[PDB]
Structure 1
Amino acid sequence: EERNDWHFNIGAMYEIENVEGYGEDMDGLAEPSVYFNAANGPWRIALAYYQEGPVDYSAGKRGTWFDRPELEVHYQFLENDDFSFGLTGGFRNYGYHYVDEPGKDTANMQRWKIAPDWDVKLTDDLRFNGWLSMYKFANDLNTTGYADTRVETETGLQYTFNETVALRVNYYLERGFNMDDSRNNGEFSTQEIRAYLPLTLGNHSVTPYTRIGLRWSNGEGHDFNRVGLFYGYDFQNGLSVSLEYAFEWQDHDEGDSDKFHYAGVGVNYSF
């Protein structure tokens, strides 16, 4: 059926950028990103573009730029009030440029995203959800050393705490395997727990992120629960601003050229 609604969603994202800074002998790099979402009934399109606009200072010879086009296809299947259905898609492609030794030095690879949506209502205060992200398209002749074609599993549950306070959990599962190789335990299986609690209150959106630690790696790395933070402010409802803040890993190093913070800023709008 052709559902009627018509809705658009456009947002952006930047890190630091030439706006707020303090230093007369150092600088960083800003990576501006864009997002374009189109809502048309059961069919929901979503795409995102990347870019880079750092400060030039005569690095090598020429400046070679590179972009990464991303697409997505959302589809609603539905079935019952308790259990729902859906279909999600994605398109990833990266271009390779080698201006060091000309001679038809160029590769070609793609990435198909396929992750359906599953919903299961067990109670009025218990919302279950799960979806497996599969990636298949390119063979990766050089990237074969790690991965290229494999299936992933990422579930997500929602538990309502209060009328103006909710909770959300997520279980990440990594997977790896070659197209065809005589192995017994070559496949990799990693697990990462990540949860966030959505807090809706007036014109202020704050969804803290929880991350457990002290359950992996020899040395120390993870600590405390609240490591992430999701901000949200809409001075006009439609237009809002989201900010991602983290506090994981230890900051014990020095430099004078490279530097990356643990925060993020972005915008969102609807037509």
Structure 2
Amino acid sequence: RNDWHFNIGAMYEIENVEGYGEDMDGLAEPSVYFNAANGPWRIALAYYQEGPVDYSAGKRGTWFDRPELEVHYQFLENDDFSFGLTGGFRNYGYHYVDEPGKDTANMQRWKIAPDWDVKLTDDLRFNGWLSMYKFANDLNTTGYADTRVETETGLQYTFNETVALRVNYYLERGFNMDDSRNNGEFSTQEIRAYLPLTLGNHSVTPYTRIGLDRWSNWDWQDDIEREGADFNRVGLFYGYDFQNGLSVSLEYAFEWQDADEGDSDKFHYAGVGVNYSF
């Protein structure tokens, strides 16, 4: 038997829509997590919430919580190949306020996800993860498709110790395996690019996501909706490592619709995180 490694941490993320010259409504997304690792094994517990930012200070709407348990096993880990596998369980416990005909819901998500890292040359790596999810229970309420596939995979070129370029293909696709179901169906494809910099104890990663294509059909999106015009997004992740097990992270991203017309809604994403490693 080997050593236990532990992490605990907490994050607070905000999403805002910008329209008519100001922040128009936003979500607040507190979360916390704990993880424990030994040899090839890792287990992670987490609790996440998403609801209206000023929900407790007066009023607002639909929120959900999302307790989670994941287990990861590293099959291979070396220089030339790494391969690992996650199994996961979440509950989505929805509380509807906005919604007519809707009340509470509990829908589970089951996850199986390989992750890999393959050396192509001394400078170049092919890496990625791919996840399959099954959603179960309350789907008539939540409107989700029963199955989903998601992957980010691509190439990493390392310049030297301080800088690396990564460029990835991203896909997310919701579909129904049950012929009877037709809700929640969508597809999103992007290219994503990152320039992670390691400057002493600071980590700085500017990045961009370039929309390739997206569509959602009838059910999906905003109940009474479902769209299909693609977004660009630019962001910056900043990390700081205190060298005593403590680290903090700050993230900011801006997203707009390259679509044509007059104006259209934009989106801001911000996050602050803390991790303690022992």
CA shift for structure 1 position 5: 2.4
Match in the other structure for 1:243:
250
Worse-superposed segment, 168-177 or 244-253: 244-253
Q: Contact (CA 8 Å) 2:8, 2:34: kept in 1 or not?
A: yes
Residue of structure 2 equivalent to 1:46: 44
Distance 1:130 1:56, change over 3 A: closer
Q: Which moved more, 1:158-167 or 1:207-216?
A: 207-216
- TM-score, normalised to structure 1, is 0.72
Structure that is richer in strand per residue:
2
Give unmatched runs, 5+ long, in structure 1: none
How has the CA–CA distance of structure 1 residues 182 and 158 changed in structure 2, closer, same or farther, with 3 Å as cutoff? same
Matched residue count: 268
**8 Å Cα contact 1:26/1:256 also seen in 2:** no
C-alpha deviations, 1:17-59, integer Å up to 9, x for none?
9999999999977442212121122111122212479898998
RMSD of the alignment, in Å?
A: 5.9
**1:85-109: CA deviation from partner (whole Å, max 9, x where unpaired):** 2211221112245799999976543
Q: Give the 5 Å matches for 1:55-66.
A: none
Is contact 2:208-2:233 (8 Å) kept? Answer: yes
Structure 2: distance between partners of 1:111 and 1:12 = 22
Q: Secondary structure at the match of 2:17?
A: coil
Query: Contact 2:176 / 2:182 at 8 angstroms: preserved in 1?
Result: no
Q: 1:190 and 1:21 mapped to 2: Cα distance?
A: 23
TM-superposed CA distance for 1:255, in Å, is 19
* CA 1:64–1:46: 2 relative to 1, 3 Å: same
Query: Is the Cα–Cα contact under 8 Å of residues 238 and 270 in structure 1 kept in the other structure?
Result: yes
Pick from 257, 265, 274: which aligns with 1:267?
274
Q: Which runs of 5+ in 2 are unaligned?
A: 218-226
Q: Deviations over 1:147-179 (max 9, x none)?
A: 121333331432102331112222211223223
Q: CA deviation at 1:132?
A: 1.9
> Secondary structure at 2:268's aligned position in 1?
coil
Instruction: Quote how far apart the aligned CAs of 1:133 are.
Output: 0.5
Deviation at 1:184, TM superposition (A): 13
Name which one, 1 or 2, has greater alpha-carbon Rg: 1
User: Which deviates the most, 22-31 or 121-130?
Assistant: 22-31
